[PDB]
Ligand binder design. Sequence first.
Ligand code: NDP
Ligand code: ZN
Lengths: 342, 460, 86, 115, 125, 96, 208
Amino acid sequence: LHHALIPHGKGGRSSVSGIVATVFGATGFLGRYVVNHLGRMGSQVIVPYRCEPYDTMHLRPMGDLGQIIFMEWNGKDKDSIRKVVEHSNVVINLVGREWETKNFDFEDVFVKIPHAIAQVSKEAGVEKLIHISHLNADIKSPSRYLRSKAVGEKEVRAAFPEATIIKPSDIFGREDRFLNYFASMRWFGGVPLISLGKETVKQPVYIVDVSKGIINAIKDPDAKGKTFAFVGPNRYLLFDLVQYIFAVAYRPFLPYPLPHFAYRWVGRLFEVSPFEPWTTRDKVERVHMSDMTLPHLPGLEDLGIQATPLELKAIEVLRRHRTYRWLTSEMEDVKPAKTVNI
Amino acid sequence: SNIVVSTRTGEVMRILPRMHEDINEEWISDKTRFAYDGLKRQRLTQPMIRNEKGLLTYTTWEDALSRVAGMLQSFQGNDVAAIAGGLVDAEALVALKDLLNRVDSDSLCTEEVFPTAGAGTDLRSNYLLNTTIAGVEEADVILLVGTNPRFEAPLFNARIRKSWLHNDLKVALIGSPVDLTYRYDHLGDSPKILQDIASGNHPFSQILKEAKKPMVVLGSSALQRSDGTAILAAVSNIAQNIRLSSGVTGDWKVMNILHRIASQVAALDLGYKPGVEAIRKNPPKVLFLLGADGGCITRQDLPKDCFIIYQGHHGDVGAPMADVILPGAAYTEKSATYVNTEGRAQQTKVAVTPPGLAREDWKIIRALSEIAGMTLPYDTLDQVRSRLEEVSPNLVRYDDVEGANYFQQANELSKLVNQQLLADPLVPPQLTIKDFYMTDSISRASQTMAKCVKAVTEGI
Amino acid sequence: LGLREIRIHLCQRSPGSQGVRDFIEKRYVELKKANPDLPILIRECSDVQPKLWARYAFGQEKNVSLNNFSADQVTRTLENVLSGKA
Amino acid sequence: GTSVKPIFSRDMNEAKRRVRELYRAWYREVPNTVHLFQLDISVKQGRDKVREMFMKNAHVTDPRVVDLLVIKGKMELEETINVWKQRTHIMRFFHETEAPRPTDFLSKFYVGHDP
Amino acid sequence: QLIAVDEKLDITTLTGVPEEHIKTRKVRIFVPARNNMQSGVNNTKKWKMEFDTRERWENPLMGWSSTADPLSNLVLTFSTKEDAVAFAEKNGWSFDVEERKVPKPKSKSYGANFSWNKRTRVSTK
Amino acid sequence: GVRTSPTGEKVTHTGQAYDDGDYRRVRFSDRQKEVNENFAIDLIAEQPVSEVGSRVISCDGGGGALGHPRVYINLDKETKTGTCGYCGLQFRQPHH
Amino acid sequence: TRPTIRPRNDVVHKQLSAFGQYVAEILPKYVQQVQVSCFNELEIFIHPDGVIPVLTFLRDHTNAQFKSLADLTAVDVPTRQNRFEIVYNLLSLRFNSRIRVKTYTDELTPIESSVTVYKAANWYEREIWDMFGVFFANHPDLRRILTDYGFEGHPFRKDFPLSGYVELRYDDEVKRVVAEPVELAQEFRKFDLNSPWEAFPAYRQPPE
Ligand SMILES: NC(=O)C1=CN([C@@H]2O[C@H](COP(=O)(O)OP(=O)(O)OC[C@H]3O[C@@H](n4cnc5c(N)ncnc54)[C@H](OP(=O)(O)O)[C@@H]3O)[C@@H](O)[C@H]2O)C=CC1
Ligand SMILES: [Zn+2]
């Protein structure tokens, strides 16, 4: 076990956990939570970054002295990957984008980069690999995002046979694009929904649950070559979910139906932004697509995680979207939404 | 000997004497003082199992414990045996005794041999230094049989020298004429002389009769040979002749046994079978080596496909021949109870924690019991010491040395066996200083004792 | 049923162990003659109470108090333990 | 008489009555605390936390110790009501960040040396 | 007026110590042994109360010695053993007490160095 | 007197160097390891041995009050020089 | 003996002894002992029931007029049955003098608050309650003054560890400051500095 890696302490900030983890995409929504959980137990965390170092400041208080090391890397350069994964025994892949830039498309961030990471980790002696895919990933979906997800998942499996693949569904949290996305369309007067959102089912999952599941899969010997599905305890209709979101935010809910072609056209119009798009055609496709049900796959309860319902965590995300009049309203005042459970 | 371990930043720096007027006075032995560095040399840090190639490889605690538990669940009764080493604490001994009893096994043995004829270990005074160390300064004559007290028990020899100097003590030895640092009357090395003294034909017998407070000390090393029972019977005959002739002076306790193993007296108090002969009579399928690094039992004396489990703190002669290795704590890394050669129970304290994944020995045994399904009734150190009190109450009195005198019953029960003595001269294992430095695993791993042996062999 | 070992924990100077002491010093030897292969561990009790322990197969054991007993009482309970009679 | 003087209460009955007064005040305060501090917990959760904190000292039999406990609880309530405490201080009662320490023998044996 | 509390003294709930460091701690009450390197006895007059040694490990950075128990350096001084026992009981700590070890009175005689017939005569000065 | 580890890491005068399997080398990636190049043992070994015509010599390290406490070295052994316990300078009497 | 030794003042010693005798005579009900140190400081040890009377006397008597309360604090001595020792330092501007009054208490016995006699005591008593846990009866507003909100325990007690029990850090998952069990990258290194040889023969205690 390489004595220098033998766990020591009480699992606190100054303890030794025996984990040396290279976390790709640690400057994202899920990456901050994963790095926070890793640094809580006293793990050596290696953060490869390509952005401005300022955008990594929030990751610095998350570890003890010397326990978080920031190194530059290039997605298309395998030497950078080898540099950042040389001394690690765990590699976690959280690289992903919800839109295509002029330099990286969906098959560059979901197929090429994950495959390169997996191959270099396998040839560098890395013992554990964690790869994040989507729950609704399949090669015949109308969304290029999910097709690239499925192709990259199978390619990562080919390159790293004993890798752990985790497929969450619609992660919600403070810095998410699920609850914030629906709360932010109040500025357009109405809420456009395809078929009024009455034929879509969503099973969102809490961000802390996903981070805990990743951490537990890191230290689970039996989870070497398995595939996990991370879903929440409740399935909602899209209409009911958005109505509950607007009720928690205390905003007037004025939904209207929009045909698929018109909504796709507005997504294409918003795609022209040189900055982060407000919405895209792929985002429209993924929002109005029902969540797959894969009961044969292991879930959070098989890693010891009890999935947290949206009702106990929606206020911590949606209280920012309230006005001053409703800013102090409590949690149990909003009458939890109707659930399509079985 | 009462000692002080001085540590700094979780590392043992040195060993110093701690003053105990009745045991070590103000002094310690060179082995006590300078063998501590052997605790940093060949250490078991992680659990190990055998892989597909037959080589020892590192393993988590869970898998090694599950393997041992699965092998233990298969066999039962006589097929499971355990041998205790020389540096095993009372808590670990009682835990192993309970664990093997739940399987209905009684083959709990020690490498050191003590005769079981007559009383055997049934009466405590049969295997104790009844006079005690402080009592040496009251005797007017002492007879030493088949021992080298200078190297077997250096502080006992220092006490004898002190009484020889100040109280004009008269000393006689039966055995090899070793240098004891004081002049003594050497009677020879033939064991038959013992019988002559009992007979009264010998000149020395009169000398014991005139003495007000005679003492007879028999080394446990002489009991390791084939005729140990006969030697013990002859020594008991001599002591009984003294007691019958001179009468009872009071609570003087003429008869003594000098031990050299720190774990022997506690094991005998707990009911461990002395010697290994029980295992050689009925070879087991599963063998527990609780720090047994003496080499008494090898894989030639065992059936093939024998599951050997070694639990210790050092990689020595007993570890490479095992299938599962469980790293344990050393005497500086646990609060453990050891019983004196005079019967005095004492307890160590934790100075540093065990290195790596090493754990306390009784905790290892209790975890293994829980994994295997026969959970032991104790979870903490206080509960396991309550169990120790349940088995032998003297193991919780931590400075008491008083005990009963059952010499009459043991002497009567030793007469029913008439085993013949051997015409082989008594030779102690330690004959010169060079043999003193390396006796157990810690001192054999010590680099300072290697220097001492090299300096003694070639002075340069 | 199968007895494995017995323990007599007697306190050295308390009056309540006196009879037990008498046993050890009168008729223990004969008993050891009769059972030359049964461990009969004689151990020294504290100031509390004398008692006898009996261990059977698979680790099951039970204890009986011997307080203020006599030599006859202690040999009676010992022979009850030895035989298949309670 | 053991030569001991009281703080407020002379027997267990008066101490129990003071305990009940403090418990009533805390139970009444909980919803106001949830509203003012903007906590993401329910009123039931806070009241259960108050009940747990009160039951943590249920084994006390000395009226003086119960008196001092009631005095400390009164200071805690006065800190909470006047908004001298912050959300961090109030939420320290719940230990959301601390990883739960296992209590059975095997887990303690696997992780380390602490009993 | 007095109220006559007849209970055992227990200030455990008032000290603010976490319950882990009250129930699982074992304290040692003892007179420290003389440092064998010096003959001074001034450090063997008072009673000390200390806690059981816990785990110390090596810092991944700089290799320092890290601890996780707050009572690692807590040593208390008492004039009598009974005071230490009372303090431990009222604080709820389980204790182990070691009796004082005092050197025995010695019989020294300078003239014994030059005995006419005894073994105590020295060979050099 | 720096030497190179088999992994390519510089070895300090204390002899420390991380092994091949040690993850702690990752702290030196994209950065450097600080090793002092002047080895005191090698530097003090270059000093010539001082010949004196007395059995006992005195050493204060030079500079008077700017050195170390003054000590006296015996030079009666002919098979070995006298070494200062502070400075490391070597002294001996004329032999041969 | 002149250069390096602090000189003596017998006149002040005599005056302080006379006034200590005076105070002991006037208040036999509460005064248990009077001392004058070798550097001319007057100390009065009193029963805990005499805090309000004695201080009031010392503030209002024409011959005392100790109008100023310089300092009030506590001392923790675990070996004593009454663990805590309450010390009042008073200054008299009229007579240019300083006096010290000492009493005792334990963890459960309240001490009467001296806010009525001296306003300055108001915070000092609070501090004592914060640092040692000594309760003061009839205090206008008795609460923590120095420690953090919700702090458990009293740090100035001898059995309180130097680094405490909890430490603070910012957590991004909950977006706030949290308290966790204390963990140290470098443990505080305890030093055994006491010499095994006696220093001051004048303070030697009987060997029992
Ligand atoms: N959020 C959700 O709803 C769920 C997320 N998905 C998957 O979970 C993973 C992480 O999710 P999330 O945190 O929300 O995604 P984010 O958009 O919030 O962060 C993506 C991370 O990947 C990095 N990254 C993106 N593109 C590149 C690139 N071309 N080269 C190098 N690094 C890049 C980003 O670095 P930088 O800041 O420099 O751009 C960033 O650190 C992703 O792989 C996503 O696909 C799984 C189900 C849904
Ligand atoms: Zn010099």
